[PDB]
């Protein structure tokens, strides 16, 4: 039939919800940002509707950074920094360590009968990648090599910059992927990879230059992000946006930070989740939980392989473990269902997990076999203890 | 660098998680089928790890033939059965109605040098099918063309077989999609779509015969689906799964069945939700409720557009609306949380919604502004009061 079409990549990532999520304004449940008060940092909740696709743009970019922060962290030429930069609508980030090989690629060059390189591959080439054939023990949140391509077609222009310590090379992405102009190669000994860009506002929904409230709205989300990434990178590397330091170097700033206005001087139980074998036992897992009466809802902030997840049974493996506990020091005192007992917890998780698969290339949700958790992970019988105390004397109240 | 690689859809679609959820068994969060006792259908959980791309393969298809009765619901020949099956591991799904134009498609046969016929690109050709233009009002399921693909790359064999009335055309694609065999093409007059194939299921984790709970608990997650669908089509089409008919036809019969084991004789609340204006006054949601004090959460099954989705907002919209007029009764009362109020209650919501857009291929979830309901829809005010009532007589028992 007349209906009957066939579509290419860059058509359809710029009308399919699938690759990013909605392509316009939308209720995103949970939508938070950073917000400073005084000298203090408060997360927020963002009540205003937004475009996911836009919020995965800079997603996109961001877990390519703290990927190869996780890649390099145990190589000699290491990432010391990841800078993001928001102004006037542009958006850039920046990380040092190695760049993206500047290379000719000979099957790319044969498909396009032109002179094509590595990093226009990595830019332009959909389901290209170094993490197509991705081991079971890698730690990367990039996995399906689409996220890059996907923040140049909702691009009026990008520009990609990377040096590999000989060379330089600089390449104008433009019109949505539309128009990939040739690079420029030159000596450098620099290194570094940068991407900046201008998303295509107008089309997601937005003002064409920002509203005042969207500017402020989407400036909070990325320094949220910033910090969420400053928490889980690892201990050489520094994260700024807009210049700035990013102060959340570990779960403990991060749960003050999201519970400064709920609970100020709020107690923070804290745990080091390990494993006995490996891959497991190299990635141990940071905790930080509030228990406040003033919490109406479980809540918890995932950042698992540098990827702000929203679902998962690594959540489920902690709320269950103390669950139980709260279930037998309460029969005791009365002598309570799995939502109870976690209801006024408030929890941040932050680490690797080796094997996990993802629910689509959004990576809302990750996917394991509960009994990874079971047989391989303990959680420290003191946080349990203490989480288990703080919830009891809650319900005794009541 | 070595590890940069270029793959092709169908080598992608075997190694990520991106396009049907985990490739492995793993732990799904609410996994249910349905059980036969006595003669009472009775929806139970399936508390074992299995395979989401497994799962999908099923789902696609059936969500493919659910979008042909909604595209012919209101024309001449129109979609009267969908016909399930799952025997010796082999899965296969009926419809009659149009079949699938048997017309040689001039673009694809170009770029494959070869008679290519519409059937082919829509089973083999990745991002290809008559959604890709897709109207904001279309409620179909189907939106990206790439749903059938996904089926075939995951069968060891696969038969597509449809005839439009002039012609019948019989197609074998096997080994994951890499041996497209050339069509069958014959006069006839039947008009039906068929999709039969065998799942991959050693690959996807499972026994290469499959074990007896592996198929006991396969069997029981399909007939579920298709009780579901039973709820979802239109009036003139029955839903068959090995043989039987599916005797689910409305909202109350999904409620009574996810709540036979917990519940029994339980009163059922009953609403219709309409809209005041197109396109939304043309979809009626149908919603029935179960309201215990045995229930431990909150829990909803939705089919949206044919789509078992876990979540959207069209579930916060009444737990919302519930949850506000709760608080003003049992504050009169008194004179409570979101977590409390619906912590009560089981509710099915069934219909169809125009213009929403999904986070992934799988449509776990839909995306949409909350301000959608509030302005359009109203939920009748005599289903609010006797939720409202039930609701709050439990919480004024403890
Ligand atoms: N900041 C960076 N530094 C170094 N290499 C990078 C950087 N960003 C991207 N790359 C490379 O470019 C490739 C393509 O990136 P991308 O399209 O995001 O795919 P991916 O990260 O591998 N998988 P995904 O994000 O899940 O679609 C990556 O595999 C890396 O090899
Ligand atoms: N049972 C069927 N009867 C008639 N036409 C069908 C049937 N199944 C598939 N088709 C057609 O085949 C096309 C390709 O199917 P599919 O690959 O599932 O894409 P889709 O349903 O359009 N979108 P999606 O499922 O979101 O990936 C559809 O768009 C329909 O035109
Ligand atoms: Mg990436
Ligand atoms: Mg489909």
Chains 1, 2 share one sequence.
Not at 353 to 380: C, M
């Amino acid at each position: 039939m007349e209906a009957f079409e066939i579509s290419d990549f860059k058509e359809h990532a710029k009308k399919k919800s699938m690759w990013a999520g909605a392509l316009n304004k939308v209720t995103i449940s949970g939508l938070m940002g950073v917000f400073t008060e005084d000298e203090d940092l408060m997360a927020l909740p963002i009540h205003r509707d937004h475009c996911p696709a836009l919020l995965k743009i800079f997603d996109e970019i961001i877990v390519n950074a703290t990927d190869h922060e996780r890649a390099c962290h145990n190589k000699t030429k290491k990432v010391t920094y990841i800078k993001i930069s928001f102004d006037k609508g542009v958006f850039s980030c920046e990380n040092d360590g190695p760049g993206i090989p500047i290379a000719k690629h000979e099957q790319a060059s044969l498909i396009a009968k032109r002179d094509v390189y590595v990093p226009e591959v990595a830019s332009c080439h959909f389901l290209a990648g170094t993490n197509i054939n991705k081991a079971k023990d890698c730690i990367k949140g990039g996995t399906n090599g689409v996220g890059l391509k996907l923040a140049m077609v909702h691009s009026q222009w990008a520009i990609l910059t990377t040096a590999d310590g000989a060379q330089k090379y600089v390449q104008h992405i433009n019109q949505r992927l539309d128009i990939i102009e040739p690079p420029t190669i030159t000596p450098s000994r620099e290194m570094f990879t940068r991407i900046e860009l201008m998303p295509v506002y107008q089309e997601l929904g937005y003002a064409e230059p920002l509203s005042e409230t969207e500017q402020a709205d989407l400036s909070a989300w990325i320094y949220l992000r910033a910090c969420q990434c400053a928490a889980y990178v690892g201990k050489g590397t520094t994260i700024y946006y807009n210049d700035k330091p990013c102060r959340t170097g570990s779960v403990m700033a991060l749960a003050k930070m999201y519970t400064l206005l709920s609970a100020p001087n709020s107690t923070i139980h804290t745990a080091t989740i390990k494993a006995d074998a490996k891959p497991y036992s190299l990635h141990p897992l940071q905790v930080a939980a509030v228990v406040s009466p003033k919490f109406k809802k479980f809540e918890h902030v995932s950042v698992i392989n540098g990827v702000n997840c929203v679902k998962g049974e690594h959540v489920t493996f902690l709320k269950k473990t103390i669950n139980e506990m709260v279930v037998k020091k309460f029969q005791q005192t009365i002598k309570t269902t799995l939502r109870d007992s976690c209801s006024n917890i408030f929890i941040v998780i932050v680490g690797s997990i080796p094997g996990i698969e993802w629910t689509g290339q959004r990576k809302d949700e990750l996917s394991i076999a509960e009994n990874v958790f079971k047989t391989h992970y303990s959680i420290p019988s003191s946080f349990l203890t203490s989480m288990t105390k703080s919830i009891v004397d809650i319900l005794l109240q009541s």
